[PDB]
Design an enzyme around this catalytic site. Structure first.
Site, short mmCIF file in Angstrom:
data_model
loop_
_atom_site.label_atom_id
_atom_site.label_comp_id
_atom_site.label_asym_id
_atom_site.label_seq_id
_atom_site.Cartn_x
_atom_site.Cartn_y
_atom_site.Cartn_z
N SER B 47 81.66 35.84 -77.11
CA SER B 47 81.61 36.43 -75.78
C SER B 47 82.09 35.50 -74.68
O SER B 47 82.22 35.96 -73.54
CB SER B 47 80.20 36.91 -75.47
OG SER B 47 79.91 38.09 -76.21
N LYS B 50 85.14 36.71 -72.85
CA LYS B 50 85.06 37.67 -71.76
C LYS B 50 85.62 37.09 -70.46
O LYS B 50 85.95 37.83 -69.54
CB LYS B 50 83.62 38.14 -71.56
CG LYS B 50 83.14 39.07 -72.68
CD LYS B 50 81.80 39.72 -72.37
CE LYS B 50 81.39 40.71 -73.47
NZ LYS B 50 81.33 40.06 -74.81
N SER B 95 76.85 40.67 -71.35
CA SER B 95 77.74 40.47 -72.50
C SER B 95 78.01 41.79 -73.23
O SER B 95 77.94 41.87 -74.46
CB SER B 95 77.16 39.43 -73.46
OG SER B 95 77.99 38.29 -73.54
N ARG B 227 70.66 27.11 -75.75
CA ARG B 227 71.97 26.80 -75.19
C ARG B 227 71.84 26.30 -73.76
O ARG B 227 72.35 25.22 -73.42
CB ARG B 227 72.87 28.04 -75.24
CG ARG B 227 73.10 28.58 -76.64
CD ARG B 227 73.80 29.93 -76.60
NE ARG B 227 73.02 30.93 -75.90
CZ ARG B 227 73.39 32.19 -75.74
NH1 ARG B 227 74.54 32.64 -76.22
NH2 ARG B 227 72.59 33.03 -75.08
N1 LIG Z 1 77.53 39.86 -77.96
C1 LIG Z 1 76.38 39.11 -77.85
C2 LIG Z 1 76.34 38.09 -76.89
C3 LIG Z 1 75.20 37.31 -76.75
S1 LIG Z 1 75.17 36.03 -75.53
O1 LIG Z 1 73.78 35.86 -75.15
O2 LIG Z 1 75.71 34.85 -76.18
O3 LIG Z 1 76.00 36.49 -74.44
C4 LIG Z 1 74.10 37.52 -77.53
C5 LIG Z 1 74.09 38.54 -78.51
C6 LIG Z 1 72.96 38.77 -79.33
C7 LIG Z 1 72.97 39.75 -80.27
S2 LIG Z 1 71.54 40.00 -81.29
O4 LIG Z 1 71.66 39.08 -82.40
O5 LIG Z 1 70.37 39.69 -80.44
O6 LIG Z 1 71.56 41.39 -81.68
C8 LIG Z 1 74.08 40.56 -80.45
C9 LIG Z 1 75.20 40.38 -79.67
O7 LIG Z 1 76.27 41.20 -79.84
C10 LIG Z 1 75.24 39.36 -78.68
#
Ligand SMILES: Nc1cc(S(=O)(=O)O)cc2cc(S(=O)(=O)O)cc(O)c12
Ligand SMILES: Nc1cc(S(=O)(=O)O)cc2cc(S(=O)(=O)O)cc(O)c12
Ligand SMILES: [Cl-]
Ligand SMILES: [Cl-]
Lengths: 242, 242
Positions: B47, B50, B95, B227
């Site tokens: 992400s 982005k 995100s 992080r």
């Molecule tokens: N696209 C995503 C970005 C981020 S971020 O905090 O790094 O922006 C976290 C994520 C967490 C999950 S999950 O494992 O909680 O389902 C799934 C995702 O698609 C995520």
């Protein structure tokens, strides 16, 4: 479209203070205030004029960008943060008057008058010195007029380039977390009675924007922190911020 | 120009973690990291892509501005904040992958590859699916390459318009107080091993900006908060933030 909520007076009464808080719900196009009369009372803008002053300076090339350094003139003044080099970001943050007085002198009275008329800013009067009229001159603006000006700035509708408006909105950044973003400007009018303190800006939420304009009686500089505190108490009561 | 500081590893050891933190002092033109090798090892951007995806969508007109609403498609997904309408600001903040997958489809492979080449972004490889190559395709970027990209963005040096860069920098706003401003983007790469979490961006101070790019092993989403936590600890150790 405008609604009086006199319950906010308790936030002023608690701190032995008196003033007005004006909120504008952008989504619903509704305004709220604790005192509609004071909401429309026009005061000297003081350092809140740094918002239009920045816009004019950037649009005229007086300020190249938010990174251009403006050196300290060497004159030691009473506010310590003023005795150093500044860019547009830090000059607005610390309300460095001598930097913006330099901007106003380069803008000149003719261009400053034309731009304030194009901005529909307050009574559009710049009588006095071009580099101090917002501190002790004839310019007067009300809390509701601050909202109308800020709403145009938010929507990039002012008669300046979009770039100038984006830079100034960036320079207005005051606070930001996962819950809200506050873009605002403080003000403290002391040279002409009544001595008042300003805080104008807006709170950005995920799906809404709440414009605010507040001013209050400020006999001493010791109560300057009440500008943000009373405003945030109103925002908390209205469930705008947690 | 580059210096290794292995004392930062204690912040990873304290949380039973492994990763790299890369800092760049813009004023001094020096860089610091706890792992020179991992700083230059290329990972899926996840992400953090982005940031360039937003720039490309804005410059090509796929996104008109930061207020354009991208309606929820109706499919209920695992992340609750995704199941609602979004604009560029909230899509970046939460995100929202499906919103940016729509951007990538509208951009198309030819324009996407052309822009990443002009950006000098990572290995500039878009091999894979047009709307998921940054999650499981061939694109790779290192922490130092993230800083190199972020420095161009900060100085409006990328080949997109200055407006597009100012809008994305606004959307990257994460935290702001009287001490610092953080513009950053999180990332979580899970589809291809090693599973890693990203945090890239910069910290704006009064007279300097510290660019940062960190990634760390992330076997589960439970430690995603590390992080920011480990990054803040490094920033506090270097006296960048209080
Ligand atoms: N696209 C995503 C970005 C981020 S971020 O905090 O790094 O922006 C976290 C994520 C967490 C999950 S999950 O494992 O909680 O389902 C799934 C995702 O698609 C995520
Ligand atoms: N122009 C000014 C703006 C502000 S602000 O907080 O509204 O930005 C505060 C000020 C405080 C003093 S003092 O009385 O403390 O010396 C003097 C000023 O000229 C000020
Ligand atoms: Cl901003
Ligand atoms: Cl972990």
């Amino acid at each position: 479209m405008w609604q009086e909520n006199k319950s906010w007076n308790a936030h002023f009464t608690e701190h032995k203070s008196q003033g007005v808080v004006v909120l504008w719900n952008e989504n619903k196009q509704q305004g709220f205030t604790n005192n509609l009369k004071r909401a429309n009372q026009a005061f000297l803008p003081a350092s809140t004029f740094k918002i239009p002053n920045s816009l004019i300076a950037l649009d005229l090339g007086v300020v190249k960008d938010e990174h251009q350094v403006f050196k300290w003139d060497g004159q030691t003044r009473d506010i310590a943060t003023w005795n150093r080099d500044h860019n547009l970001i830090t000059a607005m943050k610390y309300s460095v008057v001598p930097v913006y007085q330099e901007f106003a002198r380069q803008i000149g009275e003719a261009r400053m008058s034309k731009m304030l008329h194009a901005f529909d800013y307050g009574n559009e009067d710049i009588s006095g010195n071009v580099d101090s009229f917002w501190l002790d001159g004839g310019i007067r603006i009300s809390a509701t007029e601050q909202i109308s000006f800020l709403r145009k700035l938010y929507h990039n509708k002012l008669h300046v380039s979009e770039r100038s408006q984006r830079i100034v909105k960036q320079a207005m950044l005051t606070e930001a977390n996962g819950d809200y973003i506050i873009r605002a400007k403080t003000g403290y009018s002391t040279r002409i009675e009544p001595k008042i303190g300003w805080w104008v800006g807006w709170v950005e939420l995920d799906d809404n924007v709440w414009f605010f304009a507040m001013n209050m009686d400020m006999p001493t500089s010791d109560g300057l922190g009440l500008r943000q505190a009373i405003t945030k108490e109103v925002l908390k009561q209205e469930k705008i911020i947690p």
